[PDB]
Amino acid sequence: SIAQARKLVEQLKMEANIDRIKVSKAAADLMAYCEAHAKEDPLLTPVPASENPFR
Amino acid sequence: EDQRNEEKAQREANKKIEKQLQKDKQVYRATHRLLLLGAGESGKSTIVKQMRILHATKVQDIKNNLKEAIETIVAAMSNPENQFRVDYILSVMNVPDFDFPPEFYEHAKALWERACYERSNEYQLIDCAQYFLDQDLLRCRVLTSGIFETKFQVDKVNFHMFDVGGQRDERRKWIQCFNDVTAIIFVVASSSYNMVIREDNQTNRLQEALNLFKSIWNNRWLRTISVILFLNKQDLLAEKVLAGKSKIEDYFPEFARYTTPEDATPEPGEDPRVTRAKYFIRDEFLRISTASGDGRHYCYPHFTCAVDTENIRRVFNDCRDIIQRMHLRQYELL
Amino acid sequence: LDQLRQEAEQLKNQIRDARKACADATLSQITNNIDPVGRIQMRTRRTLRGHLAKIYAMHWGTDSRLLVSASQDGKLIIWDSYTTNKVHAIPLRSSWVMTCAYAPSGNYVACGGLDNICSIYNLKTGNVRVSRELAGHTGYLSCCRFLDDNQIVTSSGDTTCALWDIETGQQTTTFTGHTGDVMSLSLAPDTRLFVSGACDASAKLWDVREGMCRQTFTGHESDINAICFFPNGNAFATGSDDATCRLFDLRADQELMTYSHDNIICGITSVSFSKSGRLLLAGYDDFNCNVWDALKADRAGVLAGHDNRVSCLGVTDDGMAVATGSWDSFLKIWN
Amino acid sequence: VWVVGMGIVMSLIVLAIVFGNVLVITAIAKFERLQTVTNYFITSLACADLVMGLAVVPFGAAHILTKTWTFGNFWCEFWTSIDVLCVTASIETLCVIAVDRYFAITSPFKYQSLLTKNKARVIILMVWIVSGLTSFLPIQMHWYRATHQEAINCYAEETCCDFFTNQAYAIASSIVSFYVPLVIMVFVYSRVFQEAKRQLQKIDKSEGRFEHKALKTLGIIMGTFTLCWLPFFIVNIVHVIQDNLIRKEVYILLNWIGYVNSGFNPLIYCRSPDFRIAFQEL
């Protein structure tokens, strides 16, 4: 039943050897995405009442 | 125009649908729901079977339980007649396919001809085995996942009692769902003061039941639901108390200072000893109940034997009180 | 057996050291110069009535016009937001329901709960009827999501997640690795990866085709009740029971930011994002909902129109309205 | 001085009644949680009390302060009729509330099925119709008018009008308005108290070894209403059976004492924590 223990130590090995990137690059990518797509956000900028389906 | 036609059909459907829910709303408010919480090997499923009395595949299953019982007792022996049968039992100890053959079935009676059954505390087995080795439908034990629901009607009211089953249930999270239940029917074992739990040292099985009761009693969600308590397995308690072995004072040292209550309705013809124990078990249970609750909680103890005693009226009689106290408290008349 | 434990300690410390060597700076410092969003206030537009008991699930449709809700009354009602009209009331064999779904094609609706069995119905046949009954499983289900008309992914409380097959009614593949009850999941936009939040205070990143885990985040401190995804597809927000919400990153393999407040001592039941991933709406157990900021941790509005706890939340695919269900058997639409 | 000052004192009372019943009426409708089967009767009672305070109190105060009524004879006949209606309908609502509470307490299983929204609406409509039949029809038709020299002089004179009634109408109105619901409420509350005492005895027997609330609540509910209304209806028969023992001063004083029951009712009833929370919110 130590074999169940054996399975656990193999998985960690795979997850250890993966490529990583800096936090700053991910933050910049999120910044770019939000800045680009903030225009088409009805919750952020309210739409006119003449074009509001629920009103 | 065409649009006006489009609107008309939908309005009728909302009208048709809304009519149907009105009829079903009355039925929903006329049903009182009870939750059958308990502990393992406490006889809770026996109560449900007796409740299906209001309102042959299993026979193949009963043999499988018998096979499990023989294997557990034989394995327990390690802790000369038919030694080969004993070897054969070891040979047949774990066959995952079905085990139809007569020679093992014949051999099994012979092997029994031993004292392992007497040392029940040392190992873990099934209670039903002694009857099987030597009602029948309720005697067998089966572990199944899922909710068993029984609807029974009495005196122009409808009661829907359901039991939830978890083989390895712990740190239960589905208990949050049951907030509107009328009452919780808690079932305990009164003959488990001298047995271990799962063969792990654990503690006295009852100490596990009391610890479970404390968690149920003190909970944020179950802060307004009353509890009905059943002390199952009364017949086995009398036999053990009469027997010299398994002294009660050894496992629970607090019994020595305990004395009999001033108030008692000892059953007819009961020795001042069997009875004494009975109350202790109960009080131990109530002590937690009186500590908290603040008038929104109450415990109704009972002494029942699941095999013989009829208990349909007790639930109905007490359920009328639970609703009555709730209405009295709401109107401040209480 | 004890020798293998030595490798675990060395391997575990390797990941922590590697992660700590990639944290160049905090997220807040980078976005410190960004102008604040301001104050966001929204009011109820429609109120939906007809349920006899509390509600645990809700899921919008692809057309962003229809939605489905489930309750303990044994009903599975499909509403219409524009006109407030009920279209179908489906009776249920079991009165206990904990989840519901809505296929993208708009033809099938799924359900499940304490019965350990997932059920599938057929809206467009005209009588609603059961189509399949996926029953090989154990433990209460928590969530169900639709990939296509033939695939469905379910998670339950037996520490497993499986991918089913409607046509054959058998598990194509199974996922294992959790040590506690699994409580929530949702799919990626491309329907290739999905996560699962368990009760062991950890989240995992599975792979549907491969069938193996890829990453594990253990930044929380208690049970997890809900989880969402960023619209970009490279981040996901988790809301645990410790009155906190955290945002992770797949590429960075770190916890980027934490949302918490000293005046809140209640757990989170559901979280969701906005159309552009700017406002992180999150439900709460203290009878109202709070609107957070995904990058500033500044509250910008509170929705307190409910008389009980909130158990579900969702956002239309067009980003036009927010629907919140509660335990008082009432739905609401905010805009 | 005192006469002018006393009128200002009565002005404060009128303001409290109008505002007190308005708060209960608005809060019940605004919040869906406060809506229930038993709250329809409370809403009806609040509406009746508000109508009383808005209609009969200011005009009665003006009639007391200024010697001669100014609107006219027909209008003061209308005032008397609406006063009778508002007084009669208020009392019978409390009897309905007591009966509903007795049904809830004594028979719990069938309470949910017995009472419904349609049944409550029918009962309220029937009660209001019965109250209207006794009030408008005899008063407006001049059947109650008595024949006496002072009475006929007052009736013919349009300068002012005062209350003079026939023996039969006085007896019937007093009985139907007060005496019939009183014994019903007394029996109801006695049975409720007996049930509560039995339940408390059961609780004491079950887990006693290890009843001020009922008495206080019943004392408030019964004694306030009785002390407010009983003397007026015990002198109503008296001044008609016998020969002019009481003067109009004590009569009008007892009537004005009976008036303040409408103001006291919002404080006595609907004291639950939910009502307090709703009031705090709004």
Ligand SMILES: Nc1nc2c(ncn2[C@@H]2O[C@H](COP(=O)(O)OP(=O)(O)OP(=O)(O)O)[C@@H](O)[C@H]2O)c(=O)[nH]1
């Ligand atoms: N002496 C005695 N034994 C009882 C009584 N009620 C039940 N039992 C025993 O307990 C059995 C009931 O089944 P259990 O083994 O408790 O299992 P279950 O009822 O399925 O309950 P769980 O194990 O909790 O699922 C019966 O077959 C008897 O062996 C009783 O009143 N007296």
Ligand SMILES: CN[C@@H]1CCc2c(ccc(O)c2O)[C@H]1O
């Ligand atoms: C002077 N105003 C009236 C006169 C008689 C009367 C009143 C109230 C209730 C009744 O049943 C009555 O008969 C008084 O409010």
Ligand SMILES: [Mg+2]
């Ligand atoms: Mg079971």
